[PDB]
Amino acid sequence: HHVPYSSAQSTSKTSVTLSLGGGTHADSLNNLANIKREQGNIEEAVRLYRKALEVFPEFAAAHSNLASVLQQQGKLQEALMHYKEAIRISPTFADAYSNMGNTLKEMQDVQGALQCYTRAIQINPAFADAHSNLASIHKDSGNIPEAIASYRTALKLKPDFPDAYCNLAHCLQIVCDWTDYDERMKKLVSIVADQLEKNRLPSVHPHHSMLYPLSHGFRKAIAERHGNLCLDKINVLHKPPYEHPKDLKLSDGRLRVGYVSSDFGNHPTSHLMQSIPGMHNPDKFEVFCYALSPDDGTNFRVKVMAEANHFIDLSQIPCNGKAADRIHQDGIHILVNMNGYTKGARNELFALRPAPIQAMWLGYPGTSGALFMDYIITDQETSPAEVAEQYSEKLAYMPHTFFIGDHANMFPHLKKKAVIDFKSNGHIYDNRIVLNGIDLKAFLDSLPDVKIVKNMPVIPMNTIAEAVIEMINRGQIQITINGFSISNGLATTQINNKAATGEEVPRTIIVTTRSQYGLPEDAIVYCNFNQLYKIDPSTLQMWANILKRVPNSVLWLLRFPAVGEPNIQQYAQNMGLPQNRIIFSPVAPKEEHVRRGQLADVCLDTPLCNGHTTGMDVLWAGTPMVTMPGETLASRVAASQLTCLGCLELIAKNRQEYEDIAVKLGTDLEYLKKVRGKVWKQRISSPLFNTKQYTMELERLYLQMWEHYAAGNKPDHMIK
Ligand SMILES: O=c1ccn([C@@H]2O[C@H](COP(=O)(O)OP(=O)(O)O)[C@@H](O)[C@H]2O)c(=O)[nH]1
Ligand SMILES: *[C@@H]1O[C@H](CO)[C@@H](O)[C@H](O)[C@H]1NC(C)=O
């Protein structure tokens, strides 16, 4: 039940062994193979390793070395056999164990990888590669402190160690340890430079590149190499180019589109587009959904399977070749890659080119940097032609924004709201005490004294009102008033967990209060619900500047992760900024997270990496978001969202403007009222949350794509 989010792919470090003082013929073969591996001639290396084995059957080094390459080629079962052989021959061969660990990890045997890694450490405490690998497991597991400790050990043992350093850098970012941030940024760029120069795979993951000050070429370059990793996996298959359909005849004139995701389940991707396959037009389209992950038991998974014309669990088709064949057999014209370099990706499928047109959509906010993807679906705001070079792909534009969300369908209970005038006579607030429900109006009919403000219903300091706040104060789950169920916002899982996760719409009327979260009733609340890694020192300062200008305001953030909080506080103090100025809350179930958005006055977006899903989440609550688009795609999503929404006023051209916009909202209350009103109104009226329309616009784009292809034309930008 842990929250899912976009995360990068796991990574491990392979160690190559040199054999000396051994058989000369063999040593040469093994050592030469090592050279080839460095150069990317995997096939050649494999042969040499085998030959070495033929010459010297009990060559431990050869076994391990061959195994690593095989692993690289996805031949995991085979690799394991060889690793074991190496160990039998040499029980204290630490390199073999560490390497074996990587394979198991790849097979998902975490407990197994751990044992292998630890054993290697036990054999050789001075083994740096092992320490790094151990660190990755901890990092993946969420034990960032250990990962940091382990990474430091590797670095201590081996100072020039890029994989460890970069991973360490990523770790620091997650918990916001900005110690020597400037230098760190400097070192990373340097490493990438050195690596790119040396035709080595960059230690900086493509997902991570967005957070560091790298040139666009470098980021694109980084992605490309990771693209290359895929070919090696598929070249072994030795498959021939597929034959692609040139007409829709076999398909009854219906365009065949397939969506490939490891995220059909409780993941942000589903939260955004679960509704779309269902909304496709049966007359002109056939929808195939290809799942890269097993059924998680979620309604999200259920809905997509039922709604799509065809659902295929490639989860059960581990062999990439077979899977691609399956897609081809399905006669797909457009295949959409929704993972990019994200956890669960099988870009190998895309490398094989099972379809005529392959497009990147929604899931990964970056370019594939790879040859196998023809287009990246975007919007003009998000991807201006000025920066097309930043992308390997051709740009296919969406009319307003490429982004979409399923909030309308998922959280209709937030369409309307009501409040309690607690103070009560002086001042009526829209965000101190809030009520949301399917049955709200019905409930309101029962209360004669409610006052309508326009618009918004306000409940006075009633006997009823008294009871509700009492429930909140006492921590009760829910209460019944005139037969209606009024429930504590903090207790939704207790009442119904499907409700808490967004699996189902909540039945009861929910009370959300500032008191629940320790927020002030007398001040402006500025918020950000993103993962802490999206924050850099620069952003905090900007936020600090803003806070300094609004006297009793506060910043609301999440323990995402929790170890991050102390760091943020200290840094803030250095800048401003008493501790009371920043308030942290724990991560919450999806519904509550979206709902508590109503409590905030304004949301301050993160410039380095914008909130994407998070941006939609905030908007649905009718809370204005201030943003400053940057060069990267990931830095421009929020602006695109706002533009679609209709609030150009919230987009900032520079830091001064951003601070200014925020400050005005904080200080000019009528303006705040006005802007909030716009957002509340527009989320509905705008096309931002309109799934049917979005799907329609999308269908439009595909056909443009298809016609172009049918015309015998290679991909080119689509700016209609
Ligand atoms: O208290 C919270 C805060 C966030 N989220 C969700 O956590 C995920 C965060 O994902 P990611 O960090 O990938 O967000 P994005 O980059 O798309 O904004 C999203 O589904 C948010 O709705 C949540 O469920 N509860
Ligand atoms: C996380 O996932 C959503 C949906 O796939 C995607 O739109 C978003 O860009 C991802 N976030 C990041 C930071 O990659």
Numbering used by the authors: 292 to 745, 763 to 1028
Paper text:
Here, we exploit a novel approach to covalently trap OGT-substrate complexes to explore how OGT recognizes glycosylation substrates through its TPR domain. Here, we used a fusion approach to trap OGT-substrate complexes to investigate the role of the TPRs in recognition of glycosylation substrates.
A well-characterized OGT glycosylation substrate is the TGFβ-activated kinase 1 (TAK1) binding protein 1 (TAB1), a pseudophosphatase involved in the TGFβ-mediated inflammatory signalling pathway and found to be an essential activator of TAK1. We have recently discovered that TAB1 is dynamically O-GlcNAcylated at Ser395 in the C-terminal domain. The O-GlcNAcylation sites on the OGT substrates TAB1, collapsin response mediator 2 protein (CRMP2) and casein kinase 2 (CK2) are located in disordered regions close to the C-terminus. The structure of the OGT in complex with the TAB1 C-terminal domain combined with mutagenesis studies reveals that OGT recognizes the TAB1 substrate, and by extension a group of glycosylation substrates with similar disordered regions, through extensive essential interactions with the TPR repeats. The TAB1 C-terminus binds in an extended conformation in the TPR domain, making extensive contacts with the concave surface through regularly spaced asparagines in OGT. In this work, we have shown, using crystallography and site-directed mutagenesis, that the OGT substrate TAB1 binds the enzyme in the same way as the proteolytic substrate HCF1 and that the five asparagine residues found on the concave surface of the TPR domain (Asn321, Asn322, Asn356, Asn390 and Asn424) are important for binding. Although the similarity to the HCF1 peptide binding mode and the presence of glycosylation on Ser395 suggests we have trapped a physiologically relevant TAB1:OGT complex, we further tested this model by structure-guided site-directed mutagenesis in the context of truncated OGT (312–1031) and TAB1 (7–409) as separate proteins.
